[PDB]
Structures are given as C-alpha cells and as structure tokens.
Amino acid sequence: RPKLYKVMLLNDDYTPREFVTVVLKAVFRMSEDTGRRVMMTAHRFGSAVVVVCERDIAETKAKEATDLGKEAGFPLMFTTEPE
Numbered sequence: 001r002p003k004l005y006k007v008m009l010l011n012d013d014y015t016p017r018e019f020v021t022v023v024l025k026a027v028f029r030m031s032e033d034t035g036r037r038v039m040m041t042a043h044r045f046g047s048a049v050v051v052v053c054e055r056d057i058a059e060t061k062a063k064e065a066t067d068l069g070k071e072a073g074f075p076l077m078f079t080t081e082p083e
C-alpha cells in the first residue's frame with residue numbers, strides 16, 4: 001500500500017498570522033476557524049500537521065502553499081514527512 005505523508009506547517013517569525021490562515025483556507029480547503037487553529041498550533045509549538053495524504057499529493061500541496069509565502073517575500077514553509 002502507498003505510504004502516507006504528513007503535510008507539516010512550520011512556524012517562523014515573519015509570515016503574518018492571517019496570511020498563513022488564508023493560505024490554509026485556499027490550498028487545504030479549511031474554514032477560517034480551522035485555519036486559525038492550525039496556524040496557531042504551529043505558532044505555539046513550532047509546527048502543526050495540516051493533512052496526511054499520498055506522497056505526490058502531499059508534496060504538491062506543500063510546494064503550492066510554500067510558494068504563496070515565498071513569492072510574497074515570506075519564509076513560510078510547508079514540508080512533508082512520512083508516518
């Protein structure tokens with residue numbers, strides 16, 4: 001069976017809180033409330049699981065979300081890691 005991969009949101013000190021939130025809404029189809037909570041989870045504990053899915057999908061979403069921050073001049077980082 002294909003291995004599943006966690007998409008992780010990593011904290012940083014520069015990306016605006018609300019920007020992270022709308023990234024989460026747009027790329028991972030979260031509500032505002034859910035988005036804030038995941039954002040805040042990473043904010044407090046250094047990181048947060050966003051979603052767990054098939055590798056290629058996990059990689060694609062992590063990059064899409066990362067690029068949004070990157071092209072905005074933010075160090076916002078979404079990574080993948082196996083479970």
Ligand SMILES: NC(=O)[C@@H](N)Cc1ccccc1
Pocket residue numbers: 009010011012013014015016017020039040042043076
């Ligand atoms: N602007 C700030 O104070 C960031 N801690 C907000 C943030 C949350 C989650 C990930 C990255 C950034």
